[PDB]
């Protein structure tokens, strides 16, 4: 109902389990540790998923704004 | 925090550079800019699926630069200070 921008959705989604998918077809699912202003983010306890199937958990991972395509709640 | 000043201060040193297109080029860098543009002279460049060729002048822009490997004996700890 209320107007939720992308910066407020990224600030409210920090600390919770979400999934950030990139343009290359892969995605990182995990807890959002911190976010940046240039679309960059750092997650803790993240796992990689390619084609809807999990491959392995890497822990903390940093995704840039150019490589990250979208981010949703999980 | 500014790597352009560290890249421009490495002139006269021999290093290799592998761009995003898969081609490699090893030679002595003569000029480094703030935008990562590297100009060298008398460098040997070998592309992907091609033979090596020597160039007396080669200027690669910073937008096409993928990775650069300098020498292991270079003072990277002393050159990082501004």
């Amino acid at each position: 109902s209320l107007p939720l921008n992308p910066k407020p959705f990224l600030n409210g989604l920090t600390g919770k389990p979400v999934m950030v998918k990139l343009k290359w077809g892969m995605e990182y699912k995990g807890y959002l540790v911190s976010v940046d202003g240039y679309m960059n983010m750092q997650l803790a306890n993240t796992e990689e998923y390619i084609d809807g199937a999990l491959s392995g958990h890497l822990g903390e991972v940093l995704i840039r704004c150019n490589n990250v395509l979208y981010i949703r709640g999980v | 925090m500014k790597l352009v000043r560290f890249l421009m201060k490495l002139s006269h040193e021999t290093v290799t550079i592998e761009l995003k297109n898969g081609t490699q080029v090893h030679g002595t860098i003569t000029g480094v800019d703030v935008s990562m543009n590297t100009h060298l002279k008398a460098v040997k460049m070998t592309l992907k699926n091609r033979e090596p060729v020597q160039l007396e002048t080669l200027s690669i822009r910073g937008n096409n630069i993928r990775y650069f490997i300098l020498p292991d004996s270079l003072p990277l700890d002393t050159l990082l200070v501004d």
């Binding site: - | 761009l19 297109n21 080029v25 003569t30 000029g31 543009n37 100009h39 460049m45 060729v53 160039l55 007396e56 002048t57 080669l58 200027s59 690669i60 822009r61 937008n63 096409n64």
Partner: protein, 86 residues
């Protein structure tokens, strides 16, 4: 500080290889901060750069005149020789 690396190859015939794979050999008479080059007497060849070719030295060579190479598709450049008097 000096910026003479772009002015040293200015007015001379250079052969630059773009990101698309073509080789444009022409007199580099114009430059810019975005790497946009101006080639007077520029010839574009996409087959191979002729460097002592026994079978052929010019394959798929097209003359353009005043060519304007965009800096967004620039990959590398090479010097061929000095420019003419005219």
């Amino acid at each position: 500080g000096k910026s003479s690396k772009m002015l040293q190859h200015i007015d001379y015939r250079m052969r630059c290889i773009l990101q698309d794979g073509r080789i444009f050999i022409g007199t580099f008479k114009a430059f810019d901060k975005h790497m946009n080059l101006i080639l007077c007497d520029c010839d574009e060849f996409r087959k191979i750069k002729p460097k002592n070719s026994k079978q052929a030295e010019r394959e798929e060579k097209r003359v353009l005149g005043l060519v304007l190479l965009r800096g967004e598709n620039l990959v590398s450049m090479t010097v061929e020789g000095p420019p003419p008097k005219d």
